[PDB]
Every structure is written in C-alpha cells, then in structure tokens.
Design a protein around this ligand. Structure first.
Ligand SMILES: [Mg+2]
Ligand SMILES: [Mg+2]
Ligand SMILES: [Mg+2]
Ligand SMILES: [Mg+2]
Lengths: 150, 150, 150, 150, 150, 150, 150, 150
C-alpha cells in the first residue's frame, strides 16, 4: 500500500457506491489504474467486502446491550466460550480484553423478551461462564466501525 | 417493509456488490421491482449507505481499546461529554449505558503511543470526565456490526 | 381503555373507598356508566383487586432489608432461585435485574433475629445461591407502589 | 391490637372488598363488633387506607428500574436529596440504606425515553448527587408490598 | 437496673480498682448499699468480670489486622466458620455483618511472620472459606471497648 | 519483663479480682514479690488499668456497627478526621488501615434511631469525609480484646 | 555493618564498575581495607552479586504487564501457585500481598501475542487460579530496584 | 545486535563479574572481539550499567508495599503526579497502567512508621491524588528484574 491506496480507501470506507469516474477525478488518476488498485486491494485482503449500511431502528432493534462475561478458568474454557458467544443470534461483537480479563459482548434485539430468550437465558446456561454483567445501552452517540481511516 | 424487503436486506448486509440479476434470481422477482424496492428502502432510510469493509490489520490498527468513562454530574455534562468523546480520532463507537451509568467508548490505534497521545492524554484533560477505565482488547473473536438481520 | 378510565383509575389508586356518587360527580358521568367501566376494568384485569393499606410500623416491622442475590450459573438455577426467594416469609418483592445481573429482594421483619432466622439463615442454605449482599433500610422516604398513574 | 385484629388485617390486606358478613362469618364474631374494630384500626392508623390494585402492564409500564444513588457529603445533602428523589414522577419508592450507605430508588416508566427524560436526565442534574447506578428490572417474580402479615 | 446502677457502672467501666469508700462518697450512698448493688449486678450478669488492661505494645503486638472473610454458601458453613475463626490464636474479635454479608475478624500479632503462620496460612486452608481480605492497621486512634456507657 | 510477668499477666487479663494469695500460690512465688512485680508492671505501663467487664446486652446496645470511612485527601485531613471520629459517642474503636487506605470505626447503640442521630447523621456532615460504608453486625461470635496473651 | 559499609554500598548500588582507587579515594580509606570490606559484604550475603543493567527497549520488550492473581483456597494452593507463577518466562516479579490477599505478578514481553501465548494462556490453565486481572503498563516513570539505599 | 550479543547479554544479566577469558571461552570467540562487542553494546545503550545486587533484608527493608494511586483528572495532573511519586524516598518503581487507569508504585521501608512518615503521609498530601490503595507485600516469591533475556 501507498498514499494513493489510502486516499481510495478513505473514500470507499464512507461511500462505496461512487463511480470510478467520480473517484478517479477526485484522486486525479487514470480510471483504469484506479480500477486496478481497487482490484489489488481486494485480492490482498485490505478490502474484504462491500456492505449495505442498515439502520437498526428500521428493524426495531431497540434493546441494545453490552455484556461482560467472566469465564471459569480451566483448559481451553476461554477459547471455547469465545466461539460459543460469537454464534449467539443478535451478537455482533465479541472481544477478549485485559483489565477485567474477560469477554465483552455487543448484541442487539427488538425487545427485552427477545433479549432474555435469545441472549441472557442462553448465556446463563453455558458451562464455562462464571458471571455476566449486562449494560443496557440507552443511547448510541456514535457507531461507525466502518471508518478505519481518520 | 415486508418479508420481501427483509430477504433483500439480509443479502445486502452481507454483500452489496451482487447484481440485480443475481439478487432478482435468488429472491424470485422482477429485476425492475427489486430495483424499485431497493430505491425505496434507501429513500426511507432503511438502507443508509454502502461501505467498503476494510480489515484494520491492513492498516496496522493493533491497539484496540474499550474504555468506560464516568461523567462528573452537573447540567448537561453528560450530553456534552458524549459528543466530545465521539469526535476523538480513532473512536468509532460511543454508548451511554445503564448499570455503570456511564459511557463505553470503542477505539482503534496503530500503537500504544498513538493511543496515549490521541486518546488517553486527551480524555484525561476533558472537564466533565471523572474516571476512565481502559480495557485492552487482545483478541477480536467477532466484529460484524453490519449483520443486523440474523 | 380511554382517557375516562385513566381518571377513574387515578382516583381508585389513591382511595378505593369513595362512592360511585362521589366519583361520578368528580368525573362528570352517569353513575351507572361509571359502575360499568369499573366492572369492565376488573373483568379485563386492569384492576386486579382492592387492598387495605396497612402501616408496617403498626405491626412492628422495623427490620427492613433489601438484598441482592447472585445465582450460581447452570441450567434453570435462575428460574428456580427466583421462586424460592419469592416464597420466603416476609419477602414481598423479588426482581431479576440487569447490570448486577442478579436478584433484588425486598423483605420486612420485626427484628434482626427474625430477619436472621426467617430470611438470612434460610437464603444462605439455598443451593443455587452464590452470594448475597443485604442493605439495611434505615429510612423509608417513600413507598407508594399503589400509585401507577402520575 | 389483639389476635382478632390480626385475623381481620390478614384478610383485608388480601381483599378489602369483602363484606362484613363474609368477614364476620369467617372470623366468627358479631358484625357490629367487626365493624367497630375496623373503624378503630383506621382511627388508630393501623389501616391507613384502601387502594385499587392496578396491573402496571395495563398501563404499559414496561421500563422498570431500581437505582442506587450516592449523595455528596455535606450539611443536610442527604435529607434534601431524599425528598427530591421522592417527588420525581414514576418514582414510587425511596430508601436510605446501610452498606452502600446511599439511596435505593424504585421507579416505573412506559419506555426507555420516558425513563431518560423523566428520571435519568433529571437525577443527573441534581446537585447533591455523586453517582447513580441503574439496574433494569427484566423480570418481576413478585411484588406484593400489601402483604404485611405472613 | 436504675439510674444509680448506671452511675456505678459508668465508674467501674473506667477504673474498677476504686474503693467502696471512694465510690460511695462519689455516688452519695451507703457503702453497704453500694456493695449490695455491685454484688447484684454481678449476680445478674450486667458485670461479667474485672480485667487488667494490658498495653499490647508492651507485648510487642505490632502487627494488627482486620480481616474480612467470605464463607462459601452451604448448610451451616457460616455457623461453623465463625467458631473456627474465633479459636485462632491472636484473634480477639469475630463478627458476622450485613452489607458485605461476611465475617470481620480482629487479630493481633508480634510480626508479619507470626501473622502469616498463625493466622493467614491457617485461614486459607479452612474449607468453608471463599475469600479473605486483610487490612493492616497502621494506626490505632482509639480502642476502648470497655466504655459501654457514654 | 520475664516469663514470670507473663504468667501474672496471663491471669490478670482474664480475672483481675483474684487475691495475691490465689495468684502467689498458682505462680509459686512469695506474695510480697508478686505484689512487687504487679506494682512494677503498672509503673512501667504494661498494666494500664483494671476495668469492669460490662455486657452490652444489659445496656440494650443492640445496634452494633462497623463503618469504613474514606477521608478526602488534603493537608492533615486524615489526622483531623481520625480524632473527630474518636470523639463521637458510642464509638469505641478507630483504626486507620492499609488496603482500603481508610478508617474502620467500631460503634454501639441501643437502636437504629440512636445510631442515625448520634453516628451516621453526624459523620455525613464532617468535611474531611468522602464516603462511609456501614456494616451492621448481626452476630458477635467473639469479642475479647482483653486477651492479649494467648 | 557500619556507616562505612553503607557508603560503599550506596556507591556500588549505582555503579559497580568503579575502581577500588576511585572508591577508596571517595570514601577516604585504604584500598586494601575497602577491598576487605567488600569481600566481607559478599561473604555475608549483603552483596549477592553484580549485574549488567540492560535496557528492555533494546530487547523490544514493549508489552509490560502487572497481573493480580487470586488463588483458589485450599491446602497449599497458595504456596504452589506462587512458585508456578515464578517459573513462567518473562515473569520477573511475584509478590503475595495483603488487602487483595493475592499475588501481584510483574512480567515483560515483546508483543501482545507473546504475552498471550507465554503468559495469559498459561496462567488461565493453572488449577489453583481463581481470577486474574492484567494491567497494561503504558508508561514506566521509574524502575530502579537496584537502589536500596536512599 | 545479533545472536552473539544475545549470548553475551544473557550472561552479563546474571553475573557481570566474569572475566573476558571466562566469557570468551564460553561464547567461543576472540577476547578482543568480545571486549569490542561489549564496548559497543554500552555505547549504544543496550547495556546502561553494572550494579551491585544488594539483599534488602540486609538493610532491614521489611516493610514492602505496592500502592495504586488514582490521579484527579485535569491538565497534566497525570504527568505531574508521576514524577512526584518517583522522587519519594524508598520508591523504586512507578508505572502508569491501563485497566485501573492509574499509577502502581513499588516502595520499600524498614518499618511501618518509616513507611507512614516517608511514603503514606506524604502521598496523602499531594494535590493531584484522588485515592491510594496500599498492598502490603508479605512475601516476595521472586524479584529478578535484571533478567531480561529468558
Ligand atoms: Mg459496513
Ligand atoms: Mg395496595
Ligand atoms: Mg477490659
Ligand atoms: Mg541490577
């Protein structure tokens, strides 16, 4: 990658539905070259894909939660618990962090009941789980994971 | 929205670079109709945009952090602090949650130094801030916020 | 339900021993109609009953406690523990909450000994229980659960 | 009070709409005597009133919260904060407890927004307030404060 | 007991080696009467004994500790653990408290090693023990348990 | 001090109302010598006094509390707060400890009200105080501070 | 040891590569005497050795961590866990402390991965371990354990 | 640096008082070359110095402490507090960490009093300090910061 690729990516991360023309003109380079670089970035895995950004409100996902999960210590209980958490419906993010030395899970649901049935009830039955602490998101001030180039 | 829109969205949330043909054939409907519904979903704000999914590794974003921030109580200190947190470079997510009754901030940086200079040092100077607790993400088991329809 | 029912309920939640006359006159509607609406609200479950409000002081209930209870994780240990907590004498409220992700139990007793014997000693023997934290209420600034319409 | 009064109260705490006849017959005493004792209990403040028990679901009170509030130390800041908490719409219970040495507040709302606007936003502006921690009740296993005689 | 007994006790709690004469004269009552009341207080268990107040410094008890102990929940594990804690050499106080819902243990030793060997090492082996948290007293501002009448 | 003094002290710490005869005979030494050693221990401050051991139950001291107090940092705020805590009626023990790095206060009262009025309300007004956490002692398994020689 | 030895040690703790001449002249004593005292301090174990002070940056040790570890209670689980922690590569310090009543572990690694593989993953498998909390050192303001004489 | 330098450093980190001969023979290289490489490592700052390893016991440093310090947020209060902590006598280590987002301070003293006077009392007066939590090290299982190459 070079400065050029950065400028292309900075644009694609915001709006991928621009035209080579539009982008070529903005970056000041040959359209065929731009098209080449983009194809390259994809082949190399810099660009992994293109997604439709959907507003969760539209889907009535009003019950947003962030849950911390403490794994019971023991052989591979941490690796196992991670993947189990990742496959739960509504869960879009799973991270193992240092400090609390546990898992942080980001999930979304339409309602409390949906949350209870699909997430909570299920997590409280998993073996490797010691404790969980759920924080109800009452306000999303910002959520733009797509912006990786500031 | 109807069941049809859901099927379209379920696909677009995964891969937006499919062709009307490909999607029309998969959903079993007229291409002109599909094209219409998609245009409608956009006009109505269900679909807010299309982004390029970039792998952060490729950008050397290796210092991933999740920080909780306690706001000092007082007139609008909470609303103010939120927006200040959202404008910090590298910060892609800001949430106000219940339980801890504070803010959860998701950010990414290339290094610790970058993290310190851009995020930490800056946050520790903000007035409305009482305390912060940073959790270093040592492993991302999953991060697919784009998947809103399970 | 309509605005009218709300006005009736707002009154009944405060004092149920008023007379149809008194209420009819206050709401400005036919007594037979009022009587009808009240009967309807009961049949529909809006109004579940009428209780005598007894001052706990009069019964010497001076040991008021609020206890948080952490359930040991495992198949249905949460559902089971809930109901066991609800059947303990003196316990009038049981809630499962998010944040602490546990149970909050409201109870009343005449003395510490009564509290120990009936509540504490009993709770500390239950299997599904991991930890409990009891907060001694030293002052009730307000307790009017009956007021549901503000 | 005597054993007799207890039996009367035990009944009235459950259902106050019984008839003297029904109660007299159950307690095995003269109706005029029963009527006397009840009048006495009221005059003495044992029985403070009669309420209609309304199901909160019927009023769409789905956002149930239990909030702990730490008061900033200083002359009468505790007494003041208590009463301010008690006058907030939706708040039906306020207790000062030992252990956490703070306030526990019980409130009900139709939605998160209502909760934010009426409760949270308001509490975060009060001077005497140091910190608050809100626990979202996701399940009421029991709530019968009216039962004071077990 | 009466006001008179209180005055006698208030004195004895401070200095028990006064003479009936000295006390009689101070309380303004017959020496034989005083002697009677004191004998009575003893027979009734108000006064359980007379002790020599020894300065711990003199015995080189420089390692003062206050330890909180969480008992593992289960049948009588709490009652058992209490008595086991009370019989440990150097331990002079054991209390079960509400809030932390555990045991608070007061002990004294000449050195850290003595503390480790006699107290810590021993407590960490007891079955019913879940966790312990030891606070090293670096300063005794006051310790006059003998003063029960202020 | 020598082994002999230890044996004398071990006895006096339990029961100070023994007679030189009784003690002399038990320790196997001349009564005049014993009397000398005891006088010496007093003059040297090993033995600071003799107290009457009074059972707090007899005085209706049923509200036993152990309170942790965090001092606000600043010039001598710690030294000042200590002495203020020590002069509060009912407070018999004050310790500054490491770990929590605060004060532990032992107090006794007849009732909750007495506790509130005399202790709590007063402590919550002191300037140097940041936070307090009160633990209600529901059971004294042991309290024998007088035993310094095990 | 005497004042003289202290002056010698104060110097050697800073720079051990000085010459007897240089030190003799600074301390104002015969070189043969100095040489004698140093040999003595070594034979007596005051001076245990001489080390090369290596800058960790030079070795790319950028992932510095401080981890607290709670041992599960049980026969010798504490002694065992200590030694297991001490033998982990990268771990240079292990302490058992009072307050948290656990272990504090100081370690260094080149990267997060190295940290995970060598330290974290390994610690999370040890039996006697209950919980761990890792604090990522983002800045070493000072690290001079070699200075024992201030 | 190369593999050779590593072998030299691995040795010097353990014992710096070996002779070029001894080291040359062990590493299998010319003494003049070894001498060159060592001089180079010093000039480049890999090797910053040579210290005498002194046993703290010998100096009666029996009061070992590890203190966490929370800085009050505000312009440069963190940078300032760090350096103030580093200049306190007995303090050999100061680290700013993530998780607790504070400072960890390692210090040594002969006694509790020395600890109080030199460290604690002094730290509790510093402005930028919010809270401190001291952990008394009762056992050093290992302390070999000099070993940077495992
Ligand atoms: Mg996207
Ligand atoms: Mg009622
Ligand atoms: Mg005594
Ligand atoms: Mg060294």
């Amino acid at each position: 990658m070079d400065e050029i690729d950065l400028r292309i990516l900075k644009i694609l991360q915001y709006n991928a539905k621009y035209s080579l023309d539009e982008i070529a003109r903005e970056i000041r380079i040959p359209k065929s070259t731009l098209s080449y670089r983009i194809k390259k970035l994809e082949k190399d895995g810099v660009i992994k894909g293109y997604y439709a950004y959907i507003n969760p409100a539209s889907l009535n996902l009003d019950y947003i939660v962030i849950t911390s999960v403490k794994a019971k210590y023991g052989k591979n209980a941490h690796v196992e618990l991670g993947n189990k958490l990742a496959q739960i419906p509504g869960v879009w993010g799973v991270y193992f962090v240092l400090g609390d030395n546990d898992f942080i899970v980001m999930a979304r649901y339409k309602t409390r009941e949906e949350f209870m049935e699909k997430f909570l009830e299920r997590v409280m039955s998993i073996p490797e789980v010691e404790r969980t602490s759920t924080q109800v998101v009452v306000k999303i001030i910002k959520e733009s994971p797509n912006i990786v180039i500031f």
